[PDB]
Amino acid sequence: ISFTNLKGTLHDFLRNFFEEDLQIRFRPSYFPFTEPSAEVDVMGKNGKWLEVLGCGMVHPNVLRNVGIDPEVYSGFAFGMGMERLTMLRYGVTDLRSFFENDLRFLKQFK
Amino acid sequence: HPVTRTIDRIESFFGELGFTVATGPEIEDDYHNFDALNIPGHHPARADHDTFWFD
Amino acid sequence: LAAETIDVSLPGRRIENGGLHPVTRTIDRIESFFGELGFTVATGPEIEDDYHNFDALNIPGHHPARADHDTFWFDTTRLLRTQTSGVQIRTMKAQQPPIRIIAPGRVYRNDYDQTHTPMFHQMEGLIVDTNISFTNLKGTLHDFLRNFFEEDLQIRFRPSYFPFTEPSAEVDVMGKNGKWLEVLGCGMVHPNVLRNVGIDPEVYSGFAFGMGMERLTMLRYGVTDLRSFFENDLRFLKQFK
Amino acid sequence: PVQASLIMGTHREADLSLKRVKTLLNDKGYQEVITYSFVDPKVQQMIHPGVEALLLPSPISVEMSAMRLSLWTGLLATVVYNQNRQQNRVRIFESGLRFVPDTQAPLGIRQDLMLAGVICGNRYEEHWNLAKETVDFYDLKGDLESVLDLTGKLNEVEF
Amino acid sequence: MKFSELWLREWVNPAIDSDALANQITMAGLEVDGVEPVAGSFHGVVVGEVVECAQHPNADKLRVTKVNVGGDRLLDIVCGAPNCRQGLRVAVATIGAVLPGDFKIKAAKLRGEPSEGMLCSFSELGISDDHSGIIELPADAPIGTDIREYLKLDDNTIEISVTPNRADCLGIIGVARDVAVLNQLPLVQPEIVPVGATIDDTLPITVEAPEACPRYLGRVVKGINVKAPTPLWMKEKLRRCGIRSIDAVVDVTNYVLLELGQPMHAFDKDRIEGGIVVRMAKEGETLVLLDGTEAKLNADTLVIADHNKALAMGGIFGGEHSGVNDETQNVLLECAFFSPLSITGRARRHGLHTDASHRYERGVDPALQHKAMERATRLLIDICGGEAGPVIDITNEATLPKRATITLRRSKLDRLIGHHIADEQVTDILRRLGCEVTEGKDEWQAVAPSWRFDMEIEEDLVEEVARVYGYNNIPDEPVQASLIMGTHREADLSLKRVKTLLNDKGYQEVITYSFVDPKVQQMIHPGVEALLLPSPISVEMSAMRLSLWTGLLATVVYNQNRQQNRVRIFESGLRFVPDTQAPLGIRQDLMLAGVICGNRYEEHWNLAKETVDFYDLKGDLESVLDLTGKLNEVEFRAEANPALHPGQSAAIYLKGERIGFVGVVHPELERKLDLNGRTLVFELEWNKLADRVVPQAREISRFPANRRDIAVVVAENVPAADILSECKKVGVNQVVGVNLFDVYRGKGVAEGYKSLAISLILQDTSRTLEEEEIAATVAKCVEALKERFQASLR
Ligand SMILES: [Cl-]
Ligand SMILES: [Mg+2]
Ligand SMILES: [Mg+2]
Ligand SMILES: [Mg+2]
Ligand SMILES: [Mg+2]
Ligand SMILES: [Mg+2]
Ligand SMILES: [Mg+2]
Ligand SMILES: [Mg+2]
Ligand SMILES: [Mg+2]
Ligand SMILES: [Mg+2]
Ligand SMILES: [Mg+2]
Ligand SMILES: [Mg+2]
């Protein structure tokens, strides 16, 4: 498992989530459980980069503490907030409306 | 809920790749949420996450 | 205050739930097993021509498995399909490997018996890639049968013949009567089949398989007569909710 | 095990799954049936008079010699089958292809996937709090509006 | 971290514009949160000198001045700032100038006197919030020059987020070094000349915690003027990095912190008693911080003390009276390396977060303290005057951190990245980052530089190579793995299938907060102590939910306040019930709950307007439970719950296992919460019913069936389901159907009794039945109801 696989798998995912051959960049970041670590942005219609994903190659100490050999195995992990992706997908403006649970708001997602 | 729609879509995307959905408790100990992720007690991620502690 | 005590055990106000046909339950289980392997569900017309149902599957006009096939013919070209391979041929002609498709649908044979109906449901799977081997055919179908019957059951692979595969095989499960029960046919895709759809057998390889949905439904849920599936008795269908 | 790439398929959120519709019908009191694609032309001519069906020159029998122009012949036959066995209330559906001769279609026969069903008898089984009432047009229309509502286009539907 | 772009470009100036630089910084792992100009937009403002300044003859607080801007003649300008005087170098907005806000400067009269321009303040130019008076420029300010050139106002303040790794990127030198690496440019560093002592003044310094403080540099600077003004160039570099100018001494130490990343502190030397002792705090030792608040310290906290008392929190916060004050004349400059493990967490323990603590707990370059001390000494003397003593160096070489020697193998590099990077590029990248690189047999031996606290293992070098090579220069490639199915179980009941049924029964899904208001939850579950949140977001969101009803009912009230009476919702999620026998003393169970209220349907031309009742909600629950195939083994028993109507509530059982509750909300609890009317709630323990029976086909009788109706009169308190269940149990082989079709209680039956009309379907798989066998089996059910319920047949 390599960083190329992390890039290919997350590129595949974002293209199917937004149903669009959209612009995607990987940039260096930091997470204590991955090394190397990356964050993933998509080119929104507003012209700016929007953070959607954090990811990286699983740290050897994480694999060691769970009984997996980093000399033999490797892997990547990723994370993402559902609310932010939901806002970008359906055009929700305010995040608080997810937990206000206004029936006129939830009715739109039948 | 629109969040549920998003969760179900993503599960089906990775389910086709052999990914199995796994769940767990929302109240966890300091080991499985920090120490097991290379985040010891002296790491600022325990404070940068703005953790809700009970003890 | 007021004591409006009611009998909470009285039946609630609702309309009864319906269910799915037992064959539909079987098809949905198999689709989910292979969906987790990246297989796509593909469908097509039940009335095919002699090319997709025979010639494209390495079955020429002079082949015995054509006239001696219990095939429903309308004329010299059109027929009721005996295979679900027609959609696999069309998909292979439109795209290069990797291929990973399963094709459920109704197929038609002539004879009518206690264990054979003029119409039944069949699912065929197809995978084409670079290093697909017979070992992969064995491992994939073994995993499938273990999940379909939910037990470490005893299976066996046995030589057979299908014009569209070489080597060809059939898979049996050890029946409850101590005898082997034919469950499916399979094999490595014949090079002529790949060549006719524009796929190089020197670079790519694959296996295909086929199974009857009614037969597997009978073994899974203990249905003794195949006629029950198409009589559609509500007392029989209600059991599979 | 097979060694291949983990590439995700093509997904479209605008797809409405037939299984989702079958689930809603089940949740509206419908049982799924599966009938033969070739039916009796004598009965089908009573339901669709004058419409010539694709006949089989060598069928299993004359009662199974006409490719179905619709699912109604098989569905209504399933009703009579169950009604002959002391079951008046029959609420069933089926998904399957129809076969309509079309010179502009492949092989001269158009094969469209259809979703059909039929209800009869009382709205509910005998219930201590629900009155015995025969189903009417607005009962079946309501179940259809629930199906069509899954498309999000019920505001553009006309009866 | 905020910094000036021009200041950064004094160390490395790549031939790219401001936008490409900010993106380059983000592409290094330093996410740019924003880029802001250091001043407002304007033109036509130049330097000037107040050649003459006199009192306004018709305005008390105004002044009339003759301003020289290097033109053919002097300017008449009226100004009311109290600092305007006859020798000031000022910023002059000439005629035609356009200040921020399209404020055009034109010739006009103010209180009668002519004014050919305006003398500007920092606020009027958008530089800062300083509107106390007009800008005072240095005495050698070039008169004809645009202040945008003289004050270099064509600059940007770049704000970056710096993760805990990259402790080296918390100062100008650190960010510039990494930018230099990305551009393959050399780093331009200022010449920092050691000062050289002119006096021998020292004081004793002892380090009692050498593991916490491997290096402590102290220096006496005698005879300084603490009231000396900070030069404008230093004030601007502070401001453009987000730091306000306070006094000259702390401005110098803040400038060194920004320039080099090294925190420094100045004590009042004449308030240090005896000497300096760097030691752990005593347990309970108190210290009044610089903010006037008291800190009660623990024995694990490093303090900078004297021979009698503690003076400051080591590398965190200074004390109130030990710091520089208005009458300070002699200071002791502090510049130290503190071990990060000895500093981390102590600031947050006392609610502190300073520029010093932030850097020390992440890692300050341990080869930096001498250069920073000489930098601060020279700046302090050039600004405040005075004389410097010798540097007091208390360094413990044993506890100084060691630069790590890391082996980077070609195999691990190629496996983790999946894309080959040339050997020469790998060596070049690691060397430009500061590593001592020895090339070997398909491997590199790199000694990490002193400033990197994130270079300990091989994977750290893999990230450094990959990030400098560029993440987007690494191609995509799908995962090549096995296609194994995994374990399926047809007996699993999907929660998504159950949600789909509730949607098909008129229910909308909601998601509420897991923590709720205990004052509201105590109304629903009185006396039940819930796990509370110490220091929560709010007291209204401080109690972990014991059930989902608090959030569901809050959602009902929320929508009813918006003119929506009919609410039918459900939610799946965990409950949190304290249990000493449960892991972590709290049992977390996945629940499925919901609530309905209002009319049965929306207003319809053929459906009657009636309010939902118990059997409307129970019917939906039966539809859910019927997906398990075990509905015939479900029992609804009347049971008390403080939130439900005692006569219209039920506990739900499945084969004798309690799986949930359902009932009408109690009218008192209904009047509370301000519910619009009758509301009905339920909650189910999901994992109790997440299983379903896998069907096994049974033989269907080809022989006709018989129906026999019976009229069973029982006591009113007899559950009707038990009558039906007893009929199904006694009739096993023939009775293939038991159904209740009528319940009567009125004229015809005695008060307190009820008649149950039950249909019995009898059928055999091998023969037709005649009246003798039918009545025999029907009578067998009647006597069973008579033995168990003392029933009677009418
Ligand atoms: Cl068997
Ligand atoms: Mg970020
Ligand atoms: Mg999908
Ligand atoms: Mg239903
Ligand atoms: Mg055979
Ligand atoms: Mg055999
Ligand atoms: Mg071959
Ligand atoms: Mg049977
Ligand atoms: Mg920031
Ligand atoms: Mg690193
Ligand atoms: Mg079931
Ligand atoms: Mg379970």
Curated annotation (Swiss-Prot), chain B:
It is found in: Cytoplasm. Transmembrane segments: none annotated. It comes from the Bacteria. Tetramer of two alpha and two beta subunits. Belongs to the class-II aminoacyl-tRNA synthetase family. Phe-tRNA synthetase alpha subunit type 1 subfamily. This is Phenylalanine--tRNA ligase alpha subunit. The chain holds residues 107 to 161 of 327 of the full protein.
Swiss-Prot record, chain E:
Mg(2+) binds at residues 454, 460, 463-464. Its main location: cytoplasm. GO terms for biological process: phenylalanyl-tRNA aminoacylation. One of its GO terms (molecular function) is tRNA binding. It catalyses: tRNA(Phe) + L-phenylalanine + ATP = L-phenylalanyl-tRNA(Phe) + AMP + diphosphate + H(+). It comes from the Bacteria. Its cofactor is Mg(2+). GO terms for cellular component: cytosol; membrane; phenylalanine-tRNA ligase complex. Keywords: Aminoacyl-tRNA synthetase, ATP-binding, Cytoplasm, Ligase, Magnesium, Metal-binding, Nucleotide-binding, Protein biosynthesis, RNA-binding, tRNA-binding. Binds 2 magnesium ions per tetramer. SMART domains: B3_4, B5, FDX-ACB. InterPro entries: aa-tRNA-synth_II/BPL/LPL (IPR045864), B3/B4_tRNA-bd (IPR005146), DNA-bd_dom_put_sf (IPR009061), Fdx_antiC-bd (IPR005121), Fdx_antiC-bd_sf (IPR036690), NA-bd_OB-fold (IPR012340), Phe-tRNA-ligase_IIc_bsu (IPR045060), Phe-tRNA-ligase_IIc_bsu_bact (IPR004532). Its EC number is 6.1.1.20. Residues 401-476 form the B5 domain. NCBIfam families: pheT_bact, YtpR. Tetramer of two alpha and two beta subunits. Belongs to the phenylalanyl-tRNA synthetase beta subunit family. Type 1 subfamily. This is Phenylalanine--tRNA ligase beta subunit.
